[PDB]
Design a protein around this ligand. Structure first.
Ligand code: CLA
Ligand code: CLA
Ligand code: CLA
Ligand code: CLA
Ligand code: CLA
Ligand code: CLA
Ligand code: CLA
Ligand code: A86
Ligand code: A86
Ligand code: A86
Ligand code: BCR
Lengths: 89, 168, 171
């Protein structure tokens, strides 16, 4: 079923949804996601490095935590875009 | 195909309307893995019957004539256990145990689920349909008691007020 | 085949033959995501908003029930969530909402796995939906049309109200 041969995997391996998405769209999403993750890290870094005022772990912000999850998604999306491109879609 | 109780879900196969109280309710599908629903029915009845007595008892003890003697006067249902003592409780436990072990084969057997012979003269001289009606009444009452038990107990420990005390 | 709403763009095909299909899916979400999920979501969002909008406006035009908890006195539709959540109103309704939602999740799963439950159908009050498929369909569009308006309506009410601290008119 999912077994594949050659130089690129079939689109079926990308799931039931992304298997229908265009390569360019996935690329756009990938870049955006990575940006959010990096932004979150840099911003949080300032909080951790600001004198005092972060007692009781005030540096942890819900938004930044969620944003940081974009990094792993960025990897997946960028890999998927390549697969879609090779598959022709 | 579609459950009567829940109109937007498919009814599990085992629920076919044969047993009493089958309103086609098994959203989580706990009936498929089971060979039959006999043991489960025994439990439903047992749990419900105990709950029936419990709810009645709780109300009585809170608002009713207690038995003569101290240590048998505490209205608080939970405190009663300790107050009455180990001896009293143990004797009841042993009695229940005897009955449970005596009817062991019935519980794990293939007979009518819930029937241990204590039918009085009732459920006699009546057609099968009438019998089913009686059995349905029991299961409905069992389920009601179980829901009530949860509510009564929770209300007691959360609101800390008598069951029949209705104040807002 | 060009879409009716956006004549210069191709028509979304998977959405064809559905209630309220005006050919509007510029970003093509339908081409990727399961349609039944999307349809169910649109309906739920609409129904929730319809009620939400009504509640917001009602309370803003007075309407408080009797007797009313003292803590709830002097509260606008906005700035009422917190007083209520403290009293217990919100939590006491959350429980029941959760129950229905969980059973609904089971329904959605079966729908997506192929059971025959039309997206958004909970078998409630179908008696008033009419008999002819045509009238049934009109009723469905009526719900959807009102629902879409409600979603937008609620957004305006809440955003405009908080931003400029205003009452019913321009809430
Ligand atoms: C060198 C690294 C590498 C590479 C190139 C691949 C390549 C692949 N993996 Mg894979 N994988 C890897 C490491 C790797 N794996 C590791 C270390 C793990 C954890 C043990 C997994 C766990 C994993 C799972 C669980 C699945 C894949 C799947 C896939 C295929 C589709 C990729 C996809 O949909 O991503 C795009 C993914 C996303 C957009 C989701 C992002 C979620 C984030 C990462 C959390 C593809 C053949 C899929 C597959 O073959 O389907 C049958 C699949 O379901 N991988
Ligand atoms: C819900 C209970 C709870 C509480 C009170 C705390 C309390 C704390 N956590 Mg913690 N944590 C918890 C559950 C909890 N944790 C769980 C369940 C996880 C697993 C996901 C973590 C993972 C975690 C990490 C990885 C980190 C903390 C950190 C902290 C400290 C500052 C952040 C903070 O107070 O919250 C701030 C959070 C919010 C205001 C809202 C977050 C809502 C999320 C995003 C949903 C503080 C000691 C940080 C710290 O000081 O350690 C170095 C840190 O880096 N926690
Ligand atoms: C779930 C069942 C249940 C349990 C575990 C208890 C437990 C208790 N009750 Mg109680 N009670 C119950 C039901 C129950 N009650 C019911 C249904 C009533 C109303 C008739 C009462 C009326 C009641 C009073 C008036 C008093 C208690 C008291 C007590 C405590 C001392 C024991 C005693 O004197 O009981 C007395 C028991 C009875 C008067 C009758 C019990 C009715 C049984 C359950 C009938 C079932 C028998 C069964 C079908 C056949 C035997 C089973 C097997 C062992 C052979 C004890 C904590 C005493 C107390 O306050 O202690 C501080 C007390 O004064 N109970
Ligand atoms: C048979 C089950 C049962 C019954 C009869 C009651 C009855 C009662 N509970 Mg209770 N409860 C139960 C189960 C039950 N509970 C369970 C399972 C729990 C969770 C463990 C609780 C937790 C609970 C709490 C935490 C509180 C109560 C309270 C109350 C009292 C006021 C309830 C109220 O204001 O509702 C008002 C009802 C509404 C606002 C909604 C309207 C009712 C809907 C719309 C339709 C009702 C019709 C329906 C068929 C009910 C008929 C069944 C019944 C007549 C037999 C009342 C005596 C409150 C109290 O002060 O009591 C001391 C209280 O604080 N209960
Ligand atoms: C959350 C609310 C919600 C949801 C889930 C849907 C879902 C749907 N609508 Mg719909 N609609 C809504 C609100 C909503 N609508 C409102 C408020 C209006 C009034 C303007 C409409 C008007 C409308 C028309 C006129 C049509 C649809 C159609 C559709 C279907 C295809 C479009 C699609 O998949 O996009 C679903 C995705 C979203 C609604 C939001 C996704 C936004 C992305 C993820 C974020 C990006 C934002 C931006 C780029 C930054 C789908 C079932 C088409 C159809 O065929 O219906 C059957 C159609 O013709 N809708
Ligand atoms: C998304 C839906 C929603 C939500 C979250 C709320 C939330 C709230 N409403 Mg509200 N409301 C709604 C819809 C909603 N309403 C609708 C549609 C109406 C029109 C009848 C009202 C009419 C209404 C009044 C008149 C009052 C509230 C009040 C309140 C607050 C206390 C909760 C309460 O007592 O409920 C009471 C809610 C009702 C009695 C709604 C009527 C019964 C509904 C329509 C049936 C539900 C159908 C299903 C079972 C709380 C902030 C009270 C408050 O504190 O005001 C500040 C109050 O006095 N609302
Ligand atoms: C104008 C709004 C509107 C319309 C036209 C419909 C139409 C429909 N709904 Mg529906 N619904 C709505 C709002 C609406 N709904 C809201 C707000 C909710 C959430 C509370 C729901 C929840 C709901 C469920 C859970 C289900 C339906 C279903 C249905 C369909 C079955 C036909 C039916 O039930 O009678 C439709 C006939 C009418 C609505 C005529 C009534 C005329 C209005 C309502 C006057 C009523 C007076 C006033 C509005 C009552 C106060 C309510 C408010 C103030 C709180 C039908 C297409 C069922 C279905 O199978 O769908 C496919 C179904 O399972 N609906
Ligand atoms: C057991 C059984 O069968 O029961 C039956 C009962 C019954 C009743 C028959 C049934 C039903 C159906 C129901 C519940 C129907 C109710 C539907 C409902 C509640 C529909 C509201 C829409 C709200 C809209 C469109 C808001 C528009 C608001 C708009 C367009 C605005 O512009 C508002 C505005 O604020 C803005 C945003 C900006 C402001 O500056 C200006 C103003 C103020 C103008 C069921 C389902 O069959 C079940
Ligand atoms: C035609 C069109 O339209 O576009 C075209 C033109 C254009 C734009 C040039 C093209 C492109 C796009 C490209 C090249 C796109 C992307 C390439 C890319 C994106 C390559 C790697 C990302 C790797 C990551 C994120 C690795 C790890 C992420 C890791 C390791 C994390 O741990 C995240 C982390 O989260 C944890 C788990 C915990 C968090 O709390 C914090 C941290 C941060 C530690 C294409 C392909 O030609 C298509
Ligand atoms: C010195 C003297 O003489 O003065 C006396 C005077 C006076 C006033 C009498 C006194 C007293 C009080 C006394 C003696 C009190 C005795 C109290 C006693 C003996 C109290 C409960 C037994 C409880 C039972 C059986 C409960 C449940 C049994 C239950 C709940 C069952 O469900 C059984 C079950 O079968 C069902 C129905 C269905 C089956 O499928 C499942 C099982 C098997 C589980 C004094 C003051 O102490 C001393
Ligand atoms: C049989 C045998 C044996 C065993 C063996 C084994 C058991 C092996 C295993 C092996 C393995 C088991 C391996 C593994 C590896 C792994 C890897 C190599 C990984 C990698 C990873 C990665 C690459 C990652 C990536 C990422 C990132 C970075 C971020 C984003 C996301 C992700 C996660 C994707 C012995 C020698 C003892 C002896 C002889 C016989």
């Amino acid at each position: 079923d999912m077994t594949w041969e050659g130089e690129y995997p079939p689109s079926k391996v990308l799931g039931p949804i992304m298997s229908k998405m265009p390569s360019g769209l996935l690329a756009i999403i990938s870049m955006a996601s990575l940006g959010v993750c990096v932004y979150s890290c840099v911003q949080t870094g300032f909080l951790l490095r600001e004198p005092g005022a972060i007692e009781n772990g005030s540096w942890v912000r819900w938004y930044y935590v969620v944003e940081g999850l974009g990094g792993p998604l960025a990897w997946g999306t960028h890999v998927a875009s390549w697969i879609q491109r090779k598959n022709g879609m | 195909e579609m459950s009567k109780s829940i109109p937007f879900l498919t009814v599990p196969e085992k629920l076919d309307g044969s047993m009493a109280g089958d309103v086609g309710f098994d959203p989580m599908g706990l009936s498929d893995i089971q060979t039959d629903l006999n043991y489960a029915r025994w439990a439903e009845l047992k749990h419900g019957r105990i709950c029936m007595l419990a709810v009645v008892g709780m109300v009585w003890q809170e608002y009713g004539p207690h038995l003569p003697g101290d240590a048998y006067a505490t209205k608080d249902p939970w405190e009663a256990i300790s107050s009455v003592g180990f001896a009293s409780n143990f004797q009841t436990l042993l009695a229940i145990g005897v009955v449970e072990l005596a009817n062991w084969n019935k519980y794990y057997g293939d007979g009518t689920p819930g029937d241990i012979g204590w039918t009085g003269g009732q459920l006699s001289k009546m057609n099968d349909a009438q019998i089913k009606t009686r059995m349905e009444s029991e299961i409905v009452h069992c389920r009601l008691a179980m829901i009530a038990f949860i509510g009564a107990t929770h209300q007691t420990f959360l609101l800390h007020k008598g069951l029949l005390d209705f104040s807002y | 085949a060009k879409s009716k709403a956006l004549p210069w763009l191709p028509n979304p095909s998977n959405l064809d033959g559905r209630i309220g299909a005006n050919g509007f899916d510029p970003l093509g979400i339908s081409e990727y995501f399961p349609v039944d999920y999307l349809v169910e979501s649109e309906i739920k969002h609409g129904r929730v908003c319809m009620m939400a909008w009504a509640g917001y406006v009602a309370v803003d035009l007075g309407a408080r029930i009797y007797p009313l908890p003292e803590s709830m006195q002097g509260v606008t539709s906005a700035t009422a969530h917190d007083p209520a959540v403290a009293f217990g109103s919100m939590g006491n309704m959350f429980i029941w909402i959760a129950l229905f939602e969980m059973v609904g999740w089971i329904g959605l799963s079966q729908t997506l796995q192929g059971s025959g439950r039309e997206p958004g159908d909970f078998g409630w009050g179908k008696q008033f939906m009419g008999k002819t498929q045509a009238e049934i369909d009109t009723m469905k569009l009526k719900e959807l049309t009102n629902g879409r308006a409600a979603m937008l309506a609620f957004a305006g009410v809440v955003t405009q109200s908080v931003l400029y601290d205003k009452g019913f008119p321009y809430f």
